[PDB]
């Protein structure tokens, strides 16, 4: 198991990434603000916290060259929607573009509530 420390990671970040790896999401999450941008890992986590995910609304990791950014945006919007309503998380001033753009404050606001759940 990967127990290394990065050059610039806090214990909170390391715990989040460690549970990412331990929970068994299909991608090996190395950077929180670099692997969640497609929201595919977040949707997987939603399944692990017993929040249902309709993958027919989820754009698969093989994105077409045309519109891949839009497909990822749609995935982030769906992830935010699943985090607000059925997951019951406090996400004031958070939108799908924030996860798409990797806003650390709003992303941590979601992953710590994922820890809590």
């Amino acid at each position: 198991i990967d127990w290394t420390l990065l050059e610039g990671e806090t214990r909170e970040e390391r715990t989040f990434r460690n549970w990412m790896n331990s929970l068994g999401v299909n991608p090996h999450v190395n950077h929180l603000y670099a692997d969640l941008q497609d929201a595919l890992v977040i949707l997987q986590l939603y399944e692990r916290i017993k929040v249902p995910v309709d993958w027919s609304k989820v754009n698969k990791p093989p994105y077409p060259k045309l519109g891949a950014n839009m497909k990822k945006l749609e995935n982030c919007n769906y992830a935010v929607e699943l985090g607000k309503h059925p997951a019951k998380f406090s996400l004031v001033g958070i939108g799908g573009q924030d996860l798409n753009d990797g806003n650390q404050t709003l992303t941590l606001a979601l992953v710590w509530q994922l820890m809590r759940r």
């Binding site: 609304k57 077409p64 045309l66």
Partner: protein, 370 residues
């Protein structure tokens, strides 16, 4: 089934399915009619020519463009082009495909309503949508922030977007494009004794413009270079086998984009129009607009166009701003590519104007949905 993406430009028609990376059909937006007595057997039996057939038979035909300056001025010929597009080039039943159409900004509202009515009543499409061409050019570049310079055959327009938000008060539009450059090249070609006066010869001059014209990085020393030396001169062969030669007209034609006064227009060039569009935007987004100048349309294919725009906007910016111009090789199909992207998104499938919606609000539904 699948959505159709028809980019009805002024000069060329771009059409195909959503999800493809290029338009399946690209043909001139013209209609040709015979202009001579039926002296050849079998040739006189066909009353109208639409696509490339009108271009290949232009020696005995009068060519008309149904759209001028992005406005459909002949609607019956536009329907001929739409039937040709659906039934001959794509060979699809429009009743089975939602169709995505495009338009320039600041256009008359009746143009959008009539094409909505045409698609729902003449073609009975299940759903349709009208999108702004510059926004689709932004979709094609994978960006949500930036000012787009779109230049096709009829209209030049600028649209600034930040984080997916447009600033409509800063949208600019100029009725100077490729067709006007062709007409100016026709006028300046008489200085060397060449004459081109029929609509067919206009297509010949268009081919010359697309093949030998370029944008000078500095017009005044290019003028001196062509006045002293011959190295700028190039030759072209006419359909009868005559050969013409141009040196100076190669860059004097595209210079009109930067100097519209060559054709008596008072308006500022495309560089000043882009800069003024940025200066109408809020001061906090100007740095991001200066770094995202997207080029689009066939008139932006001249060699040296991006370098000249870089130099002119840099001459206009506060120097501290990093001016960047984005000019992808696929610039000729950025609008269509963006349309296939948008029509492919699942988040867009509720944005279609369905026929049922149109059955309630009539053609005015297009102003609310689009």
């Amino acid at each position: 089934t699948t959505a159709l993406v028809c980019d009805n430009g002024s000069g060329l028609v771009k059409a195909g399915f959503a999800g493809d990376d290029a338009p399946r059909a690209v043909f001139p937006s013209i209609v040709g009619r015979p202009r001579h007595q039926g002296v050849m057997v079998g040739m006189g039996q066909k009353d109208s020519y639409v696509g490339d057939e009108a271009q290949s038979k232009r020696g005995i035909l009068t060519l008309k463009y149904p759209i001028e300056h992005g406005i459909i001025t002949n609607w019956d010929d536009m329907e001929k082009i739409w039937h040709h597009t659906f039934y001959n080039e794509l060979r699809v039943a429009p009743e089975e495909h939602p169709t995505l159409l495009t338009e320039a900004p600041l256009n008359p509202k009746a143009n959008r309503e009539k094409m909505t009515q045409i698609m729902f009543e003449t073609f009975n499409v299940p759903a349709m949508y009208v999108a702004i061409q510059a926004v689709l050019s932004l979709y094609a570049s994978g960006r949500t922030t930036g000012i787009v310079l779109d230049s096709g055959d009829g209209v030049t327009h600028n649209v600034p977007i930040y984080e997916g938000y447009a600033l409509p008060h800063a949208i600019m539009r100029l009725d100077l494009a490729g067709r006007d450059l062709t007409d100016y090249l026709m006028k300046i070609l008489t200085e060397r004794g060449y004459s081109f006066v029929t609509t067919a010869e206009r297509e010949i001059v268009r081919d010359i413009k697309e093949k030998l014209c370029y944008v000078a990085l500095d017009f005044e020393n290019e003028m001196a270079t062509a006045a002293s030396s011959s190295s700028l001169e190039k030759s072209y062969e006419l359909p009868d086998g005559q050969v013409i030669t141009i040196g100076n007209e190669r860059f004097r034609c595209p210079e009109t984009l930067f100097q519209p006064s060559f054709i008596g227009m008072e308006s500022a060039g495309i560089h000043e129009t882009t800069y003024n569009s940025i200066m109408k935007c809020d001061i906090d987004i100007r740095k991001d607009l200066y770094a995202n100048n997207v080029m689009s349309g066939g008139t932006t294919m001249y060699p040296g166009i991006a370098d000249r725009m870089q130099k002119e906007i840099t001459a206009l910016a506060p120097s501290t701003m990093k001016i960047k111009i984005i000019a992808p090789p696929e610039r000729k199909y950025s609008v269509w590519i963006g349309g296939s992207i948008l029509a492919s998104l699942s988040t867009f499938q509720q944005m279609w104007i369905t026929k049922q919606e149109y059955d309630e609000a009539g053609p005015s539904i297009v102003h609310r949905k689009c």
